[PDB]
Structure 1
Amino acid sequence: MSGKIDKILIVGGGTAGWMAASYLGKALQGTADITLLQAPDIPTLGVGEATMPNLQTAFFDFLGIPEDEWMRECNASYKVAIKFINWRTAGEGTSEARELDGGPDHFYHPFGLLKYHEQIPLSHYWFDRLYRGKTVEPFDYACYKEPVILDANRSPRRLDGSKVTSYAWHFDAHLVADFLRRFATEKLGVRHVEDRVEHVQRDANGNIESVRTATGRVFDADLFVDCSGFRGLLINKAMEEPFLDMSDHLLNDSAVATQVPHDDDANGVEPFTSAIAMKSGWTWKIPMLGRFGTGYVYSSRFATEDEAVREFCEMWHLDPETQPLNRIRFRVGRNRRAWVGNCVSIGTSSCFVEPLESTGIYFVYAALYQLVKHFPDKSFNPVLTARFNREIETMFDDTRDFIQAHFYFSPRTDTPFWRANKELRLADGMQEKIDMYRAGMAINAPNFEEEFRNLWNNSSYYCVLAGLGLVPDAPSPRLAHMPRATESVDEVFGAVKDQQRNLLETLPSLHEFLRQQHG
């Protein structure tokens, strides 16, 4: 009879650490004692975080915190989609879409559900019409209502509060992390120690015995949670688990970022993240209240830091000599194993990929969900660890593949960077998914375990691949056997056009809804 875990030590007091403290503190409910160790570091600008809808259903709902409670205290805005700008046209980094085929070079990846027609996704009917010359409309404007209401900065909620589409949040992570520190220490009994790790002692099995801090205090536990960020103080340094670099799939490894004040009264608030193609990378725009966070993700093999700073500042009309800037060089990939012995990594200590599809916080609460599901006893059954590690590696490798496809299938050839992306190879499993796409199949066609497995599904692949201009070889074969379905789909498209018109005319602006929600 081994006995349950009694003591957990979390090392790192950032977003990941305080998410871990809250999630573990809640699911356990007094069963175990949890201490979080946090070192005084130089703080960084609030450059922003873009999220996904299950931040509420999988994380805050689990904590018992309603969306209104946390959202107002963290000054969050609403995210209805990612808007991809200038991924298809040559040129310099600008916040302004270039002209492509008589219109602006952008396309949306919304959180909205893709309608099915006779059990087949509307995407397949759209391409059948495109292939047969019956349409020339872009996928996203043909198949989603959101694009035209996003073009007008509409709110996803009516003033009375009713929701007309799926949405997520834009916020400064520091504010959520402080909110969660207060919640975990004041309501869940997590003990906070402010101290710097100086020495990690391991036992004869190579497990962590204790952590000693710079003041000389010694902390032992049954389970150690590494939330120390890119340093990987426990997983990489103490435990010596290798990090698997994956820059043979993703060339971006650096960023320069700031926060820019914004006149919401004059310009309203954009209900979407922007991902703006640059000469050697892409730049995010995460709108918040009276400001937006922004960052240029670039590849040090194709632009110097000075070049990146110039390109970044010129596009927002900022003074390089006086704008406060954060610079970082990050590692791209994941640990060979996320959980080794009695040490589980959570957050960027575990894995990292550029924030092109808003996965950073998702990786934390998805791993925390998996960690509770595979929670060990004192026997630490190796199968629990093995299964956990396999969930993490497919969570990460699927996202890595999806993100590479954003660059691999961009039509641009105008800089060494954009050409270089096309000389990398896709992973075998991603090449299979592309083949499936081109054969007319619906990838992972549509509860958190289902969202976890089907994160990147047919909707996501059409949004990005057809947005960029990769489409199937021929119409999906079943459609030629469904003459009634293909003749009646006219009314489904027209239904989308109706909702576009009616929402455009009746929806308040996001600015108007956000003012009401605050004052």
Structure 2
Amino acid sequence: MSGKIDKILIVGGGTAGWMAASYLGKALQGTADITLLQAPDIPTLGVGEATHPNLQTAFFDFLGIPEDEWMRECNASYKVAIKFINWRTAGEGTSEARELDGGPDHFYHSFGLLKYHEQIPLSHYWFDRSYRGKTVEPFDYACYKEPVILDANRSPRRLDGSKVTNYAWHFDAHLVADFLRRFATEKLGVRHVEDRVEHVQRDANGNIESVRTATGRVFDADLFVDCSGFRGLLINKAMEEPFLDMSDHLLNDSAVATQVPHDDDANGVEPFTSAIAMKSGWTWKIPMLGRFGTGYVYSSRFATEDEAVREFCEMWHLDPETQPLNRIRFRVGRNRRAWVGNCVSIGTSSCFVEPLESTGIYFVYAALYQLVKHFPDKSFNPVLTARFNREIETMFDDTRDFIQAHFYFSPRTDTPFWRANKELRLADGMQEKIDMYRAGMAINAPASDDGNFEEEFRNCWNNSSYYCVLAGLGLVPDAPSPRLAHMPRATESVDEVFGAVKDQQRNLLETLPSLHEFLRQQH
């Protein structure tokens, strides 16, 4: 008809559903009735989530929830980077970095800012000097202060609370889902109903009229938010929207994961996510308090579940026959359209990719940001739906492209998995970015090098991220940027810029507490 949305039904009560309830509860507050339907499900182990800095500025801040309120309640730790281990060297799946050229085979994709120098990113000066043999230092150690302090498990804040670098969070998603469920029901008036969808009623325009639950209750709404996970009960099963499998870009479709106890008093806490290259995939390590989550993401085309269970358990010296394990088969890809008619998918009902760059929770609140930006009324103007679906489809495919490049540009050829990855095609948009990168250009350079989710959303994979991963793996431009041969003042003074980085490395290495000591003081 027309008028404002009066009633919203969220189907699904995991992390996405309760993020959707809390974000919509706050954004529309007092002007819509929100109900969430969640059925009891077999519980899983807390295998860990790694996040991005704008989890605080785009989500919890929007809720009005200060970082310390949700941190203490969710037993969270700090993330300063992803550390990529053994992506360039042949061998078994092990937690120890092999040796490369006199050093450990690792590199960092950190959250630090890449400094500009005369309107040109430090990455271009680094490669100019490396190409001409004036340096042999790796890109991440040359252009960021973080690698040196992450090697020493430093805290990102000083013990007086001073923040010295940008950081994200490690936590158990189950605890955040519980925190938000309490927040949404107790403070935003979201109705929780424990029930299982049995039938979805569609009208002759193809919109959802009502959902009937197994107890016979009927829920009607103006807007239906599908947060039912991989099953996609609304968007795929009721609305019949196709899912785009994207196995021609991403071979990984499975995981085996668990949680491992950890003596933080004996070993400290690593302030980073580890992505550890394996024979047929890669393994995440997400440090938490007293434990770490870990999971082997692998490709069913190259390893059986038993082979993956054994490789994963042997690597951590666990018993394959008795270790409590989550065995998962992922749905990799996205719906053809995220929002159809009066049904909006949020979470893995919408899209999923392996967590190689910690996008799972980002995709939820980014989409929720896009839903409110494009919020309809009961007439459901099709431009709003089309302009949202465009944003979701670009957010995902860009991430898909970026992640594929982690495997496509690895030098490894030792197993059928790493060799097969080089036989897939990059998407046209990705290949153009590579052409630019090889031609010495920045890729999606940030407008500034200095909170604003719209800028972050469009430049989420920027020039710093592409250099960190591509140069980390050893793909570097064909030759230096031609604009540097005409800027001898710039290339002569940039020595001071790298020197400022080394000073920060040595000063922060000398004065920062261990992440363990700071975590200990925060309790």
TM norm structure 2? 0.99
Q: Measure how far apart 1:321 and its partner are.
A: 1.3
Distance 1:184 1:331 in 2: 28
1:417-464 CA distances to partner (integer Å, 9 max, x unpaired)?
Answer: 000000000000000000110111111111111100000010000000
Q: Equivalent residue of 2:5, what SS?
A: coil
Q: Measure how far apart 1:30 and its partner are.
A: 1.1
1:319-338 CA distances to partner (integer Å, 9 max, x unpaired)?
Answer: 11111000011111100000
Distance 2:518 2:120 in 1: 35
Q: Equivalent residue of 1:311, what SS?
A: helix
Distance 2:130 2:35 in 1: 58
Distance 1:26 1:187 in 2: 9
Q: Measure how far apart 1:503 and its partner are.
A: 0.3
Q: Equivalent residue of 1:100, what SS?
A: coil
Q: Measure how far apart 1:11 and its partner are.
A: 0.1
| Runs of 4+ deviating beyond 4 Å | none
- For the pair 1:308 / 2:313, whether they are aligned, the reply is no
Q: Measure how far apart 1:492 and its partner are.
A: 0.7
Q: Measure how far apart 1:92 and its partner are.
A: 0.2
Alignment of 1:359-438 (within 5 A): 359-438=359-438
Distance 1:350 1:129 in 2: 44
Q: Measure how far apart 1:105 and its partner are.
A: 0.2
User: Paired residues, what number?
Assistant: 518
Q: Measure how far apart 1:391 and its partner are.
A: 0.3
Distance 1:336 1:284 in 2: 29
Q: Measure how far apart 1:119 and its partner are.
A: 1.1
1:334-393 CA distances to partner (integer Å, 9 max, x unpaired)?
Answer: 000000000000000000000000000000000000000000001100000000000000
Distance 1:292 1:322 in 2: 18
Distance 1:494 1:376 in 2: 53
Distance 1:263 1:117 in 2: 44
Distance 2:337 2:357 in 1: 23
| Match of residue 231 from structure 2 | 231
1:289-309 CA distances to partner (integer Å, 9 max, x unpaired)?
Answer: 000000000000000000000
Q: Equivalent residue of 1:275, what SS?
A: strand
Distance 1:445 1:422 in 2: 27
Distance 1:381 1:497 in 2: 54
Moved more, 296-305 or 1-10: 1-10
1:438-491 CA distances to partner (integer Å, 9 max, x unpaired)?
Answer: 111111111111100000010000000000000000001110010000001111
Distance 1:497 1:504 in 2: 10
| Match of residue 216 from structure 1 | 216
Q: Measure how far apart 1:238 and its partner are.
A: 0.3
Q: Measure how far apart 1:139 and its partner are.
A: 0.2
Distance 1:349 1:196 in 2: 16
Q: Measure how far apart 1:194 and its partner are.
A: 0.3
Q: Measure how far apart 1:2 and its partner are.
A: 1.9
| Match of residue 175 from structure 1 | 175
Q: Equivalent residue of 2:522, what SS?
A: helix
Q: Measure how far apart 1:130 and its partner are.
A: 0.4
Mark the runs of 5 or more structure 2 residues left unpaired by the alignment.
Answer: 447-451
Q: Measure how far apart 1:234 and its partner are.
A: 0.1
TM norm structure 1? 0.99
Distance 2:158 2:205 in 1: 59
Distance 2:331 2:187 in 1: 35
Distance 2:461 2:485 in 1: 27
Q: Percent identity?
A: 99
| Match of residue 469 from structure 2 | 464
Distance 1:310 1:394 in 2: 37
Distance 1:96 1:225 in 2: 43
Distance 2:307 2:322 in 1: 16
Q: Equivalent residue of 1:511, what SS?
A: helix
Distance 1:139 1:517 in 2: 34
1:251-308 CA distances to partner (integer Å, 9 max, x unpaired)?
Answer: 0000000000001001000000000000000000000000000000000000000000
1:212-268 CA distances to partner (integer Å, 9 max, x unpaired)?
Answer: 011111100000000000000000000000000000000000000000000100100
| Match of residue 479 from structure 1 | 484
| Match of residue 331 from structure 2 | 331
| Match of residue 507 from structure 2 | 502
1:485-516 CA distances to partner (integer Å, 9 max, x unpaired)?
Answer: 00011111111000000000000000000001
Distance 1:115 1:358 in 2: 24
Distance 1:301 1:386 in 2: 35
Distance 1:144 1:508 in 2: 19
Q: Measure how far apart 1:196 and its partner are.
A: 0.6
Mark the runs of 5 or more structure 1 residues left unpaired by the alignment.
Answer: none
Q: Measure how far apart 1:57 and its partner are.
A: 0.3
Q: Equivalent residue of 1:318, what SS?
A: coil
Q: Equivalent residue of 1:366, what SS?
A: helix
Q: Measure how far apart 1:118 and its partner are.
A: 1.1
State the superposition RMSD in angstroms. 0.5
Q: Equivalent residue of 1:210, what SS?
A: strand
1:151-177 CA distances to partner (integer Å, 9 max, x unpaired)?
Answer: 000000000001000000000000000
Distance 2:223 2:270 in 1: 43
Distance 1:112 1:517 in 2: 23
Distance 1:362 1:315 in 2: 29
Q: Equivalent residue of 1:491, what SS?
A: helix
